[PDB]
Amino acid sequence: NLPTAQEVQGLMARYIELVDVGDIEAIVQMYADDATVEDPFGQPPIHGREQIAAFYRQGLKVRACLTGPVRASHNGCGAMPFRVEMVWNGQPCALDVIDVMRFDEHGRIQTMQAYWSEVNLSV
Amino acid sequence: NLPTAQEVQGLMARYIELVDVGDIEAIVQMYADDATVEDPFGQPPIHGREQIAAFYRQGLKVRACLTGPVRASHNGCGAMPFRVEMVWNGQPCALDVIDVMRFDEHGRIQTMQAYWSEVNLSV
Questions:
Q1: Is-contact A116 A97, C-beta < 8 A?
Q2: Residue-range definition of the domain harbouring residue A27
Q3: Which of A79, B32, B35, B116 is an S-S bond match for B120, by CB 3.0 to 4.6 Å?
Q4: Minimal Cα–Cα distance from B112 to chain A, Å?
Q5: Which of A7, A98, A112, A116 to mutate to probe the B interface, most B CBs <10 Å?
Q6: Chain A: closest CA distance from residue B61 (Å)
Q7: Which of A66, A121, A72, A58 is nearest to A98 (CA)?
Q8: Binding-face residues of B in 31-90 toward A, CB within 8 A
Q9: Is the alpha carbon torsion for B87, B22, B32, B72 positive or negative?
Q10: Which CATH number characterizes residue A106's domain?
């Protein structure tokens, strides 16, 4: 069903758990089959599970953690602040990001937008 | 001009400064004359400076602070996490919110959406 505010908080927290462990197959399954992803926002979106799996496989030694609570509305939308830590060519860096997600009538991510740019990178 | 990523960070930080001191007239001036505000997201928007000034006058002993950095893109958009502390009928409460804003070709807030619901309230 369309996730309630409480369900949206749980789903988005799970998403960060999956990104942290790096379970690409579990991440891809959270998305609707025809979902779109705009990461970083401003860049053209990728559509469908195939392109989404490719995107995550490429992106994922990475650890992610929520840096604040998940803000959720009553219409299946949520926004959350988090940090991603990686090692860019020997040198370890961090990225502060805010994801905005809209879930569908089935509890799957219909659309995801990630807000960040170089101003949010620490290398 | 269309704010750069760095300018978006500065504008959004200023916005929280204004909300914190409670300078309603300075807040209203940051918006475009025909801007829309959806606070909380899910609720119908209010349009134009008149309705926006009314909204802030009604909403504003309140203190607000950024609880993390402003995430900014290259297309005039930004997202930021913050907390608002107030006193609801004798009892002091807090609200964790995430605002997403889009600026226009003049550096004014064209649209603002606030993500939060009762799950983000501590009373």
A1: yes
A2: 1-123
A3: B116
A4: 14
A5: A98
A6: 23
A7: A66
A8: 40-42, 67-69, 71-75, 77-81
A9: negative
A10: 3.10.450.50
